[PDB]
């Protein structure tokens, strides 16, 4: 199938571009308190979220040779009422089609951020109450109508200052696959 | 030679950035610029073109009156994005006249694209960052597949 | 290659101006960017950084506490001769940003450019231009030849 | 001996072309938005150089009771110059004779014609709130003199082609001719 090859190549070049947008370097200066990013777990789509108070790694991994360099970045997602019901269950749930729940701070892993956009919302102090934390949500759904073509992302070529070679190779490969897609 | 043609119409649009001429900056913690404002058109908030200047003028005198409670500390910082403003002037040119952060303010949005520089990748001791307050009882993260990490 | 060394580079600099895409705006001259601060490496601009954003927030807030007045332009304040931001494609809205100034502060002077917008004449009925107070002790203006006061 | 003659000829040509472009740079179309208080303009009405001074105000005040009619409007710019003591002691004859390098002089607001600004700079010294008491004038002197201790090569004044925004046909020919005579001079 022409489209099967097309799809496969497209999504391989897709998977290639990341792991450079979220790293211990070229990323942590961007994770501002108010930056807008994405979160993509296996089979889970939370939506949009606002980074808040990313914290230094609490290394506990017995990797026996590595330095356990995973970072815990905290974002403000609307995961689930069902998931805030039980605090002891170490798991989150994506946004159900049901009642829209409440906003809470989820310390997701850096390797989960699919995209790191440029739109940076203003964050209010005193994010302890439940009502003002909804003021963020109504602001998010604001920007999504200001840009009806999707929120602009941060291409690492010109905007993040990525100077490596492999990412350039993958960019060339995806451009080639795109120009090949014209002949469907 | 499309690039030779291109390398002439670019530096034209780059006129806004000036780097006027050879300056003599005998210091790097008090000399050099502070920040460059690009006042936009069709903005009724341009009537405050004087209060902004008064603020940026009182800022240096407040930094002077708050010089320090003398303590020995390097307080050094690096640059996330090294894109320094162009220089059409036919001494220091790296630790000064270098955009560290550039934002495009909106009525409620922002367009930050360079971020504040960090010290030892730790936002907990930097000079500019400020973390809000929150409860944070959400014991144990949800990692990916079989990668449960005992954070605590 | 050799020529594309700087062209590929300066794209960063000529994109830091920014124009992400076609943005839907309705309130022309009240729905759009206010400033664009370019922070520089200096102990002043990296300790009071949050104070800058607090100042801008207080400014945008205090602008919203005035009504029942016509004080926005009041003079048909047409544009000075700008250098417009590049139109990045990733039609309409021809009134777009069209930056109208830029200043560097060195704590004892100001490196201005692009001047400052103002109507045809009478530079005392426009936003800005706080003239100092002088005495004007002279009564005979200099000239080349003739046309004396 | 003809080499020095040709050099003087090309120098005079360069000077006349400079005056011909200066007659375009300070025309009150593109230079009026560039007359904020503090632009560090220069004035020389063919007799003497006043120096560097900060702009205080300007106006389009026309000729009241026009002698022999009036068909072109004039502009008067109040600029803060450094005059001499003897000139102020009378202050009625011509408002002239700036201070000499043998006197420290004192600064005062002087009205000047629009066609006398022979250089427009791109620097804005800060002005005290209300000035007047001639001792903050001394602070203005200190500031304008300390600024001179930062650009020993020469203050960058302006560039007529981009900064102003001149898009009139013909300036390209004169700019080509000035660049040509400049090259020819720097060579021989």
Author numbering:
A (entry chain D): 624 to 807
B (entry chain C): 61 to 150, 160 to 221
C (entry chain A): 61 to 150, 160 to 218
D (entry chain B): 620 to 807
Show me the paper's own sentences about this structure.
The nuclear exosome targeting (NEXT) complex plays a central role in directing non-functional transcripts to exosome-mediated degradation, but the structural and molecular mechanisms remain enigmatic. Dimerization preconfigures the major MTR4-binding region of ZCCHC8 and arranges the two MTR4 helicases opposite to each other, with each protomer able to function on many types of RNAs.
This module is formed by the interaction of two ZCCHC8 protomers (referred to as ZCCHC8A and ZCCHC8B), involving their respective dimerization segments (residues 78–198). The dimerization segments of ZCCHC8 intertwine to form a central six-stranded β-sheet characterized by domain swapping: the first β-strands are exchanged between the two ZCCHC8 protomers, resulting in a β3A-β2A-β1B-β1A-β2B-β3B topology of secondary structure elements. Beneath the β-sheet, two α helices from the ZCCHC8 protomers (α2A and α2B), positioned below the corresponding β-strands (β1A and β1B), pack against each other in an antiparallel fashion with conserved hydrophobic interactions (Phe115 and Leu119). The ZCCHC8 AIM is indeed embedded in strand β3 of the dimerization module and, as such, it appears to be pre-configured in the β-strand conformation with which canonical AIMs are known to recognize the MTR4 KOW domain (Falk et al., 2017b). At the C terminus of the ZCCHC8A AIM, the polypeptide chain makes a 90° bend (residues 185–199).
